[PDB]
Design a protein around this nucleic acid. Structure first.
Ligand SMILES: [K+]
Ligand SMILES: [K+]
Ligand SMILES: [K+]
Ligand SMILES: [K+]
Ligand SMILES: [K+]
Ligand SMILES: [K+]
Ligand SMILES: [K+]
Ligand SMILES: [K+]
Ligand SMILES: [Mg+2]
Ligand SMILES: [Mg+2]
Ligand SMILES: [Mg+2]
Ligand SMILES: [Mg+2]
Ligand SMILES: [Mg+2]
Ligand SMILES: [Mg+2]
Ligand SMILES: [Mg+2]
Ligand SMILES: [Mg+2]
Ligand SMILES: [Mg+2]
Ligand SMILES: [Mg+2]
Ligand SMILES: [Mg+2]
Ligand SMILES: [Mg+2]
Ligand SMILES: [Mg+2]
Ligand SMILES: [Mg+2]
Ligand SMILES: [Mg+2]
Ligand SMILES: [Mg+2]
Ligand SMILES: [Mg+2]
Ligand SMILES: [Mg+2]
Ligand SMILES: [Mg+2]
Ligand SMILES: [Mg+2]
Ligand SMILES: [Mg+2]
Ligand SMILES: [Mg+2]
Ligand SMILES: [Mg+2]
Ligand SMILES: [Mg+2]
Ligand SMILES: [Mg+2]
Ligand SMILES: [Mg+2]
Ligand SMILES: [Mg+2]
Ligand SMILES: [Mg+2]
Ligand SMILES: [Mg+2]
Ligand SMILES: [Mg+2]
Ligand SMILES: [Mg+2]
Ligand SMILES: [Mg+2]
Ligand SMILES: [Mg+2]
Ligand SMILES: [Mg+2]
Ligand SMILES: [Mg+2]
Ligand SMILES: [Mg+2]
Ligand SMILES: [Mg+2]
Ligand SMILES: [Mg+2]
Ligand SMILES: [Mg+2]
Ligand SMILES: [Mg+2]
Ligand SMILES: [Mg+2]
Ligand SMILES: [Mg+2]
Ligand SMILES: [Mg+2]
Ligand SMILES: [Mg+2]
Ligand SMILES: [Mg+2]
Ligand SMILES: [Mg+2]
Ligand SMILES: [Mg+2]
Ligand SMILES: [Mg+2]
Ligand SMILES: [Mg+2]
Ligand SMILES: [Mg+2]
Ligand SMILES: [Mg+2]
Ligand SMILES: [Mg+2]
Ligand SMILES: [Mg+2]
Ligand SMILES: [Mg+2]
Ligand SMILES: [Mg+2]
Ligand SMILES: [Mg+2]
Ligand SMILES: [Mg+2]
Ligand SMILES: [Mg+2]
Ligand SMILES: [Mg+2]
Ligand SMILES: [Mg+2]
Ligand SMILES: [Mg+2]
Ligand SMILES: [Mg+2]
Ligand SMILES: [Mg+2]
Ligand SMILES: [Mg+2]
Ligand SMILES: [Mg+2]
Ligand SMILES: [Zn+2]
Lengths: 150, 138, 208, 234
RNA sequence: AGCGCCGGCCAACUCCGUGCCAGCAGCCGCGGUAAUACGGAGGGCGCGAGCGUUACCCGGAUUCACUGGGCGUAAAGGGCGUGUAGGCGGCCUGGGGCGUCCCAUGUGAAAGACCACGGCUCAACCGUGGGGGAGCGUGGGAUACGCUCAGGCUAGACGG
RNA sequence: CUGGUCCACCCGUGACGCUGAGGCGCGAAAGCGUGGGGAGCAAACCGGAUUAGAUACCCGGGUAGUCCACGCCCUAAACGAUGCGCGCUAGGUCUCUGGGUCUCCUGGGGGCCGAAGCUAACGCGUUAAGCGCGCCGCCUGGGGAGUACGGCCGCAAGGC
């Protein structure tokens, strides 16, 4: 049903007397490889718990990617903070040309052919979020049509 | 003084839409009027009409949006998501029929001004002509 | 010189059984049969989640090792694949499958590819009659790959060509076990082959 | 279920600090106060109540929210007068949003009512007959109307969106429809089925909430008499 | 049958020897008695008549941003004004057609590159054939926008 | 004696506009030149204390200077550290100054809080750091260095 790809795990630190106090952050993508993906960032005392928490968050926060034969309906650029993502549609055979973060989200969304480019800050967390937004912003001819009618 | 009346109109529209106005006036000019024709026919704006305000000729542009939405922030989606000026005073931009751009795999448009009149990128392509690439809308 | 050395060890590093020996790889002995862990002193130790890179590297190393081809030649074929029209992935495979040495092996004239290769280097092979000792020679559609008249009586030839009786063969190939002739009907479809390889990752490896 | 000349109470409220987004629902300014346009008050009521019958005669669980003490009682009255729950005292953050947790309090309340009617009331020192006596007592100052909900409401009936903004924010979040009598100081766009009227003044709130509760039974078929809260309007 | 790697980036790990020594090191960094980072050995990864090193060019570098960047506090608004050149210029109509756009046409050497067949057993290499146009010249055409000349207008500016 | 500017009337001209390299002018304090003038204050300086020392902080004195006139100098955390102009995009509240049918509308300023939106945050938000067009100036990792050389300017100190 749903696949799980862990984008990254990190061990942040906070301060109290005595010393440091670690916590863990996990970015996990979930997808059906058929037009449905979700992103999740969960933090917890232990990695495992963090990942799970992430996965869990990933399932709420899903996006309906309008695939068109393995590709996107059209090109789009989205900025999330100082991170920018460029998604460009492509013909078959092309593949998923992208950085680890975008591809992970792209493949689980069931995208198989696409041209990608990370601009600005390449902070994984924000680059991932920029991506979700990009997809979320994708429109279909039928959609545009629906909008332009009235 | 307005340095770019077209850019002004484009923004007036961009601005009004971001706060969901009904209409929005813009000082009238045939050329602006021409662009509105396209905008209307393409279905980005409900329509527009000439109007006199304070004695001066303007153009009510009736905008249109999508339907109310679910969850937090019910504000409707924009029909005109993007509308950017291309050619500008001091940096004019032209294109031959062979160089007319394909705005968002067609889900969008580009209004050029050709000696055969103001046309969408598709219309121009058809009559096989190019010109000043005025703006792009989607 | 195309590798040449301990071969049922590559099978072990790819965690998948590759047929670089033909028989022996069928009888409980391709090593993968009870000893499927990587070669070396650390072969049995638990592995660590490989980097997206590792995964992509081993995949290419798999496909490449299957045909005992060099990186130099393997890359040159892939670049050719890219350039050509149509899906690079398949097209690539189509080209690998068109190597005379491979075809010799496909037609059964030899048990493995490394043997098929040698059969070519030694003139025991013929393409449309003329001799051809270039294992990288690209077989085109319609070509007839046979055994040299003078080689048809060789001990090893009979054995293999014998075992070929009744045996079915590639839907894109055709074997006339009689005169020891074979015909390359057409380029295999990705659907035609069934290699334990996700060519998609291979393209990605070179896209880096 | 109906009414027109209702200037008998609602219409026009709040001084000048408003919210421009609530201008369509405004008729004019008088003595410094905005006078709501009842004509539109009507239009919405219709569309809104129509939504009520809809969920009503269908098994639709509506949750009533009214903390504004100027209507705390008028709420539980018309609320209890239906299998409809309510939040009267203070809206606890996460009731809808963190329902499963905020629920254990209900699962604890009921249970603390067991002990206090069983062979264990007089067991263990007052060191507990007090701690548990208060726990149970507070668990009831708040969860009296919330006690009912088994699952998220099918809709939310709020009295003052601006005041009960935290509930609304959760409704929206959970795609739970939002019904609310809203005043000149609130943001309409946040309310799914609006009743543009005087959100203050008991005579108002009671009139609306009442008829809205009438329609609710008169929708689930139960033929009931007038409202028992028309008294608390003094 | 070699050569380079096995701390991260970056595919590949264990023992011993050395101790802030001897040394490694592209960047971050390793070594002051348990070093996967030094040296050796076993094992492994990569490539293979080649493998590494140095130097140099483009890339990644939207890191000079035309495509594609910035300047409140990160590097960055001139101390302020006046004003020359220059850049930029509201609404309507007309003439011109310079920019701009369209059609023809000439030029655009061969080789190279691209596609297709061929010749050396393949290939490298090579041959034949096929499109591919930008730039510029010429000849027609269009006139929305920019330009220019005429004439109007008051919503900019200035004046009473 | 003289500059700017705001409002009302809607009266006159008829795009006469915006920006602005260079140029020219203005430019806090200190400082320079010539001549005045010096109450108070006070770099240097002369002393008294403090201190481990005290070329300081505290105390008693005190010259340049601070003031005026003429010339110079041209720098600053010259700051909103935010270049100028125009158009567009909720509102509340306090305030200065006009006009009005003087609840309160209107116009031009000064503050605060905030729609949308923007921002790395902090915050900005019709007095934008928002959405746009025009033109100028400026940035491109730190140190070396605002240094060296050269040029220009200045009596010098020094400035660019
Ligand atoms: K943004
Ligand atoms: K030792
Ligand atoms: K070692
Ligand atoms: K470079
Ligand atoms: K400065
Ligand atoms: K003309
Ligand atoms: K923020
Ligand atoms: K000098
Ligand atoms: Mg974290
Ligand atoms: Mg969709
Ligand atoms: Mg997009
Ligand atoms: Mg940015
Ligand atoms: Mg960067
Ligand atoms: Mg614009
Ligand atoms: Mg736009
Ligand atoms: Mg452009
Ligand atoms: Mg452009
Ligand atoms: Mg290809
Ligand atoms: Mg509480
Ligand atoms: Mg209220
Ligand atoms: Mg590794
Ligand atoms: Mg040791
Ligand atoms: Mg190393
Ligand atoms: Mg060689
Ligand atoms: Mg690259
Ligand atoms: Mg570059
Ligand atoms: Mg650089
Ligand atoms: Mg640029
Ligand atoms: Mg930058
Ligand atoms: Mg600083
Ligand atoms: Mg700075
Ligand atoms: Mg300034
Ligand atoms: Mg003009
Ligand atoms: Mg001019
Ligand atoms: Mg003209
Ligand atoms: Mg011309
Ligand atoms: Mg030509
Ligand atoms: Mg040529
Ligand atoms: Mg040939
Ligand atoms: Mg040729
Ligand atoms: Mg003409
Ligand atoms: Mg033009
Ligand atoms: Mg005066
Ligand atoms: Mg007049
Ligand atoms: Mg006149
Ligand atoms: Mg100026
Ligand atoms: Mg000028
Ligand atoms: Mg001065
Ligand atoms: Mg002075
Ligand atoms: Mg003096
Ligand atoms: Mg003197
Ligand atoms: Mg003194
Ligand atoms: Mg001391
Ligand atoms: Mg002393
Ligand atoms: Mg003193
Ligand atoms: Mg200041
Ligand atoms: Mg104010
Ligand atoms: Mg003001
Ligand atoms: Mg004011
Ligand atoms: Mg906001
Ligand atoms: Mg920050
Ligand atoms: Mg923050
Ligand atoms: Mg503010
Ligand atoms: Mg502005
Ligand atoms: Mg800023
Ligand atoms: Mg300037
Ligand atoms: Mg500078
Ligand atoms: Mg430097
Ligand atoms: Mg420096
Ligand atoms: Mg200096
Ligand atoms: Mg000099
Ligand atoms: Mg001199
Ligand atoms: Mg100095
Ligand atoms: Zn084997």
């Amino acid at each position: 049903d749903f696949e799980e790809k862990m984008i990254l795990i990190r061990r942040t630190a906070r301060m109290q007397a005595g010393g440091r106090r670690f916590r863990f952050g996990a970015l996990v993508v979930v997808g059906d490889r058929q037009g449905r993906v979700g992103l999740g960032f969960g933090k917890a005392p232990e990695v495992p718990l963090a990942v799970q928490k992430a996965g869990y968050y990933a399932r709420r926060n899903m996006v309906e990617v309008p695939l068109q034969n393995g590709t996107i309906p059209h090109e789009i650029e989205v900025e999330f903070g100082a991170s920018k993502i460029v998604l460009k549609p492509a013909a078959p055979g092309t593949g998923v040309i992208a950085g680890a973060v975008p591809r992970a989200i792209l493949e689980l969304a069931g995208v198989t052919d696409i041209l990608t480019k990370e601009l600005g800050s390449r902070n994984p967390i924000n680059i991932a979020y920029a991506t979700m937004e990009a997809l979320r912003q994708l429109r279909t001819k039928a959609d545009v049509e629906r909008l332009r009618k009235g | 003084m307005l340095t770019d009346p077209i850019a002004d109109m484009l923004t007036r529209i961009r601005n009004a839409t971001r706060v969901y106005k009904e209409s929005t006036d813009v000082p009238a000019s045939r050329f602006k009027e021409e662009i509105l024709r396209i905008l209307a026919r393409e279905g980005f704006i409900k329509g527009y009409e000439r109007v006199d305000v304070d004695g001066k000729p303007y153009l009510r542009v009736y905008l249109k949006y999508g339907p109310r939405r679910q969850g937090p922030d019910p504000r409707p989606e924009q029909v005109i998501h993007h509308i950017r000026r291309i050619s500008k005073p001091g940096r004019r931009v032209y294109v031959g029929v062979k160089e007319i751009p394909r705005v968002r795999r067609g889900l969008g448009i580009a209004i050029l001004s050709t000696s055969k009149g103001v046309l969408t990128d598709r219309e121009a392509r058809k009559l096989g002509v190019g010109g000043e690439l005025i703006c792009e809308v989607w | 010189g195309r590798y040449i050395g301990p071969v049922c060890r590559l099978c072990r590093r790819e965690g998948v059984k590759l047929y670089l020996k033909g028989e022996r790889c069928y009888s409980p002995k391709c090593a993968m049969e009870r000893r499927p862990y990587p070669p070396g002193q650390h072969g049995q130790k638990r592995a660590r989640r490989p980097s997206d890179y590792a995964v992509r590297l081993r995949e290419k190393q798999k496909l490449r090792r299957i045909y005992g081809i060099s990186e130099r030649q393997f890359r040159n074929l892939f670049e050719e694949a890219s350039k050509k029209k149509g899906v690079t992935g398949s097209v690539f495979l189509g080209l690998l499958e068109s190597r005379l040495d491979n075809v010799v092996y496909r037609l059964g004239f030899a048990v493995s590819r490394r043997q098929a290769r040698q059969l070519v280097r030694h003139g025991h092979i013929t393409v449309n009659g003329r001799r051809v000792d270039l294992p990288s020679y690209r077989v085109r559609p319609g070509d007839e790959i046979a055994v040299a008249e003078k080689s048809r009586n060789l001990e090893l030839i009979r054995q293999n060509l014998e075992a070929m009786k009744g045996r079915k063969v590639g839907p894109w190939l055709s074997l006339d076990v009689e005169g020891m002739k074979g015909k390359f009907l057409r380029l295999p479809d990705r659907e035609d082959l069934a290699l334990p390889v996700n060519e998609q990752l291979v393209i990605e490896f070179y896209s880096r | 279920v109906k009414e027109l000349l209702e200037a008998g109470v609602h219409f026009g409220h709040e001084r000048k600090r408003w919210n421009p987004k609530f201008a369509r629902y405004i008729y004019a300014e008088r003595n410094g106060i905005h006078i709501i346009d009842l004509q539109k008050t009507m239009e919405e009521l219709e569309r809104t109540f129509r939504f009520i019958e809809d969920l009503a005669m269908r098994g639709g669980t509506i949750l009533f929210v009214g903390t504004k003490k100027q209507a705390q009682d008028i709420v539980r009255m018309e609320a209890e007068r239906a299998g409809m729950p309510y939040v009267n005292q203070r809206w606890l953050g996460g009731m809808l949003t963190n329902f499963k947790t905020i629920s254990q309090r209900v699962h604890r309340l009921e249970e603390l009512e067991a002990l206090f009617a069983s062979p264990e009331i007089e067991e263990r020192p007052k060191k507990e007959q007090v701690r548990l006596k208060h726990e149970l007592e507070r668990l009831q100052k708040y969860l009296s109307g919330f006690r009912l909900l088994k699952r998220l409401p099918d809709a939310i009936f709020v009295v003052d969106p601006t005041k009960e903004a935290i509930a609304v924010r959760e409704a929206r979040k959970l795609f739970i429809p939002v019904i609310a009598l809203a005043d000149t100081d609130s943001d309409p766009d946040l309310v799914d089925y609006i009743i543009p009227g005087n959100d203050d003044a008991i005579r108002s709130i009671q009139l609306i909430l009442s008829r809205a509760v009438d329609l609710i039974i008169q929708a689930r078929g139960g033929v009931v008499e007038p409202s028992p809260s028309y008294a608390l309007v003094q």
